[PDB]
Amino acid sequence: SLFNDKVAKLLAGHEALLMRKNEPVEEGNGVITRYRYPVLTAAHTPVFWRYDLNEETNPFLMERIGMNATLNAGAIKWDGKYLMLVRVEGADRKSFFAVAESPNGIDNFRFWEYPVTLPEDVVPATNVYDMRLTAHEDGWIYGIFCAERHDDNAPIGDLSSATATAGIARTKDLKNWERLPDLKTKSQQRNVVLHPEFVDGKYALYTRPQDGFIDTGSGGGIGWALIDDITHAEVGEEKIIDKRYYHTIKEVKNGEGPHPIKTPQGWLHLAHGVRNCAAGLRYVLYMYMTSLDDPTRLIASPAGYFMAPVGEERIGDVSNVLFSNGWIADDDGKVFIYYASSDTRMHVATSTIERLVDYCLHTPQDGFSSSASVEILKNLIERNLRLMK
Amino acid sequence: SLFNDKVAKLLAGHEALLMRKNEPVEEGNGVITRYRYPVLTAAHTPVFWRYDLNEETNPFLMERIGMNATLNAGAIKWDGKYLMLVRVEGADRKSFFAVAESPNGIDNFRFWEYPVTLPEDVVPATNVYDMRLTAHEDGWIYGIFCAERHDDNAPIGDLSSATATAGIARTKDLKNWERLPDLKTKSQQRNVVLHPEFVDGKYALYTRPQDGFIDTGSGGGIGWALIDDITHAEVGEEKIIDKRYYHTIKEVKNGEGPHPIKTPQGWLHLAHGVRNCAAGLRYVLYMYMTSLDDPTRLIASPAGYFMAPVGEERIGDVSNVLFSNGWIADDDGKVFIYYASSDTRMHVATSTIERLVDYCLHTPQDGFSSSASVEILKNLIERNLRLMK
Amino acid sequence: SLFNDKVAKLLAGHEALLMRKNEPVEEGNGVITRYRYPVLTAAHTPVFWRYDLNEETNPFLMERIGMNATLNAGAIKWDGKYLMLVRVEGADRKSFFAVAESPNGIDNFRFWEYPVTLPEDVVPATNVYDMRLTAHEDGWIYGIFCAERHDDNAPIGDLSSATATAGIARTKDLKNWERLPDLKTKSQQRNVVLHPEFVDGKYALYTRPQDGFIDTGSGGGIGWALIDDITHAEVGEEKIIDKRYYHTIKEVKNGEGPHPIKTPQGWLHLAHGVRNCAAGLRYVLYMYMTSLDDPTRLIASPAGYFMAPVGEERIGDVSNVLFSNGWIADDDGKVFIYYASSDTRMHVATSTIERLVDYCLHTPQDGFSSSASVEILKNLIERNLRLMK
Amino acid sequence: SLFNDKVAKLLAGHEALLMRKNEPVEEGNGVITRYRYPVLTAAHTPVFWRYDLNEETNPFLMERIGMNATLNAGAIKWDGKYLMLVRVEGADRKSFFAVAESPNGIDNFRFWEYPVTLPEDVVPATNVYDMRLTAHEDGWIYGIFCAERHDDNAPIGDLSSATATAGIARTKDLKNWERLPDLKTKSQQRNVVLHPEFVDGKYALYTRPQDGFIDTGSGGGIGWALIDDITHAEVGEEKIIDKRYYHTIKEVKNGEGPHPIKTPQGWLHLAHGVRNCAAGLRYVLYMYMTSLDDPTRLIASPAGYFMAPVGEERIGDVSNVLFSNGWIADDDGKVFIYYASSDTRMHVATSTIERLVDYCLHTPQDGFSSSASVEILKNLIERNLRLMK
Ligand SMILES: OC[C@H]1O[C@@H](O[C@H]2[C@H](O)[C@@H](O)[C@H](O)O[C@@H]2CO)[C@@H](O)[C@@H](O)[C@@H]1O
Ligand SMILES: OC[C@H]1O[C@@H](O[C@H]2[C@H](O)[C@@H](O)[C@H](O)O[C@@H]2CO)[C@@H](O)[C@@H](O)[C@@H]1O
Ligand SMILES: OC[C@H]1O[C@@H](O[C@H]2[C@H](O)[C@@H](O)[C@H](O)O[C@@H]2CO)[C@@H](O)[C@@H](O)[C@@H]1O
Ligand SMILES: OC[C@H]1O[C@@H](O[C@H]2[C@H](O)[C@@H](O)[C@H](O)O[C@@H]2CO)[C@@H](O)[C@@H](O)[C@@H]1O
Predict the structure, then answer these.
(1) Number of domains in chain A
(2) Which EC number(s) does UniProt give (chains A, B, C, D)?
């Protein structure tokens, strides 16, 4: 029948999309390798999430539930596989979480047939997003995410003012999720991330204090907070680890991405930095390192951005944005960086621990002015010209 | 001569552009079919609107009047033809109206040789835009549009503050237009649209009360107002029909598009919804239905967006926008939806009354939260997996 | 060795990029001719600016200093060559100046091996940008640029508030630059430009008074100020030459681009105009002319924009922007216009003095309303239809 | 496993290829419509014909039996479906027959899982090829094909000398084939085709007498032979119906394609014509019509070719060739023409009975000289110019 042929073609086209081999982009900067195709798009969501496949109830074979974007994904190596914890945004503008897995880390990502069922905390949330996964030494996988609600303080007609809390959930199988109490804290928080080891016998969070839902106000950067009990999590002392600076890529706000990778040289961090421009907010990725002895102590601050939107990345629902809350480092040192572009699609970039540490240690630090930038550059030029002779 | 050859080539290239056959995009969602090419762009404006073709006064053969965009078009079936009432924006940043016609509804749109001459109301307007055409049962074609003027209240140096009124004009041939008094109302209005039938013997308008020129403030959504005399139009009672909601595609504002289509199941509406993001305002299209017995009563509210920017649509003068104020439904049920992308160009999408009603009735309603979205999705997945077994 | 082969390929690929022949775009408006490729991108910066080429210190051969954008360039004809004074933005978000030269004006631009060393004025600047070069009759090449600093008045957490001064430097070889005192003035200034001739025996500046760092506030447009001593430059009297207007392409702000070209008909100006839209600020180019007898007197005001973003130009770090602060007119009348798109890359457009003057004189003036625009257009249509008969 | 993933991808890629929607080529001559994609290529053969899918016996997953070409196909409408009787050539250079079916006639052709098992006649054949299917009024489907054998009457070392005979088989299900005795005839024969009706109570064959295996020699064209008993088929009298002509597209040889279609105007024929050129033999398609009352009598001979190689068709194993031995005419008059290009792939072209008859009746007959061609052309030009005036 025509209907059955149509269903068969939808399914076949979907498999062809899912199975497409990714290829590295030859042109690069020697630090990271980009790939020709996104690892996930809205079109990668299962056909059976979007269409009612029953001819009796959907004779025209149209989508019943539109999928809009696959973005800001957490990531974990899981039982031999490369997993993303995807933020999937429906056409209804709500996001939910969904696991996708790949055998190789760069292609053939496929969603688990059901998305994540995440129980509410005591106060229901309207939207949940941007989960960072941490395999903690306590044996649990934690997902720390943003739980967003309408601001009850808002005046008449204001249906946009919102509040953000840090949601905390844990699991041992990524299917059954236990919802713990939202993080208790004196300001708004987003980009909260669990450090994978106890520090002084306590849970350690990366935080991002902010005075408002979008603007950080007095918030100074990426913070560090020790928590006695993750099941009744409350911030007491909070220390800023990586600061915002005028006229850098992290001027207006910043935030930790995935939890950092442990290297022999220190903790290797991936974060985002924001500035304002005539087109709105511009988000790029950057890196820094902290000490193994004292994870609050910066030991590498390469100048500028690590990655910024290139080509197709520049455009989407929220253009001029890269964002990452997930990466995977294999035992052999290979690193798979999962980053969203423009709040619309997921990409992968690859590198190695050795290359990323090299980048952090030997990209000169920002001297914070045009004159300083020129002096650093002239020094490199001089070395190169002498060599090229 | 070289000049004459140049004119001949301008004219020939223009005809080739105008005559190009459109083709449907194979990949779609089963609800609407997109098309490979826009139905109108600035390049579709006549050569003789832009160039002075006289060698004596334009020896270099350069454009004398630049055309910037063809957007936000009304639409009507007219004497066997498919007509758009185009908003054409010049390089001078003023818009004017112009009729374009096609024999088939998807390609070969051609502007009438002269654009629309629209007389001023008592108070002159600086810009006019976004006309909705209504063939009213009273025998007139009405165009309801936005008439914009500088805000006299503005302080020194403020050359941007503006006010919007609903302009009302009528015609029986789309060439001779009678300008009626601007709509009298207690707030700013844009997206005002005439319902095609009398209701309780009165003219019925879709309205969109707004506290400011761009922000709606207390304005609750798309309104309904009965008007005794369209030639002295004044709003008295006003009822909100379709409301804004936090964390939907119509959070910050919304507005009726073209006048709705009458179906056996009810009035079928096409509207736009706006939210804010890091890149600015994002505009998408959505649908709803109201009762034939009581056109103020919602009877279908499919969740989320009906159409959102895809591909080339995402980029233009005002990126991240779809907007529609025109569609045509033929007697056989075929629907031609005319929508602008990014305030720059006009597109067509096709569907049928049956498919659009199916979409409105069977796309689940928004339960307004991530948890609710997940439950709806899990229900569909469960049905499909049982079927696919 | 593999490393040496990699270096050799980086260098070879760079030469292939630099040497690529540009080609004009056939489709145009008869006023300006666009070109297929940008004249500069970040990839055009020398390999030896970005990479450490020594295997001992960079064994992975990765970039040590990322380059982000090449934009807003000044321009001058210099000893037979076509020169841009490029604003180069590093990955660190600081800009610096750098000379690039071409033998023909449309391709084969190559950076001088060292960028510009620009001494600080008494108060150090954080960023410097957008230099206009003027070969003044006094025998010096002046560069007038923006010097930006953090606003000390800013409250806690505000790392974005900034102040702009007009920096002044001069040179006779484009390598050794003398920094003069920043322009003294009662308001913020950006887009300051030196007129190439003395007027009443005084230096003459194009100015752009603004109440704030981004918003002009009461600032009325492009100004004119006579300065007694360029080495102790201070504005006294200041006159607005070209004004902002509601509902034009220069509504919110405007600014002089390069210094104007002297023609037998008057001074030929290139400027930018800004308006706000749902996507942010939109920047286009426009032209005007002033009198040789009195350079403060407007003698041509063609309506609307001269150039606006087309195609690839629309997208970049700061999308929806064209900006020019450099052009070159050869003795034969050929004009090379150097314009940035989206704060990301540099383009060239070509025309002639005769064509640009024709465009300025015969593009109708803006009558400031939709009705006026329609009347101008109908007049041209009528002439053309009579001719085409 | 990696192996199972590879098999899954082979199968998925194959289904995507098989299900691809064909699209008509817009630009045409108004007689036939070509299509963007071939209906069959060697890649369309089943994955399980080429690969051993068992990891135990094919651990590298390589092809065990290469498929080289899908060409010269018969065709029949069968139980509601569109069927080709494909000549499939293996990498071993032998051809075999195989049924492929489509629901619509222009795409989604899929081979039946097993190819045709064709029993040998008394003398074994080395190759079999180019089957024409005839649903005869006697209730059988006949396949008339070429059976080729080596000719040992050849100099030593001559392994190219061959003899072609007409093989005859019949079936009622296209799976079980009965092999009848090869046609007995005084010359070599290829392109023998069964007429679908008895003529004076006898079977009627289109023949093509030829003195050699490749060259026709004295063979004058397409012949007609009445046969008493198709199960002991022997030609007696043989009349040429359509002749070769110097300096036409059928100079060196010609041959009937599929059996002709019955129309109210006569029998509608599709044939091939051959000439020699510097590159070898050139094959094109042409048409002719014969009388219903007397099928030996020509009643239409449009000049020149009907179709000749265009674009991709020009190149393959045997370039510069079109060949057809199959077409289908639906009850509504729509005609699907299945033609091979360059002995490599199968294409479809569509027309209607009305259009093909119009083409045959109104394309002027060949007057056989340049002067005559010019006079015919000048006559049409004269009519057109007077009309265009
Ligand atoms: O959009 C850029 C980045 O903004 C942050 O989150 C958004 C969130 O995605 C929206 O749904 C909501 O309306 O506003 C938030 C605040 O701007 C950031 O956490 C990222 O999620 C996002 O990529
Ligand atoms: O730009 C998006 C949508 O905004 C609305 O209108 C604009 C109008 O087009 C502008 O010329 C003016 O400056 O501001 C208005 C308010 O934002 C909307 O009605 C649509 O016309 C437009 O697509
Ligand atoms: O971005 C558009 C235009 O804005 C102006 O300058 C920018 C400057 O480039 C930024 O680095 C700074 O942060 O803000 C300035 C004010 O918006 C303008 O002078 C152009 O440089 C620029 O193309
Ligand atoms: O085909 C190559 C070249 O052959 C010569 O002429 C051809 C002629 O074009 C054919 O029509 C005829 O059948 O055979 C001739 C002899 O090969 C040569 O003079 C060129 O015309 C032609 O390009």
Answers:
(1) 1
(2) 2.4.1.281
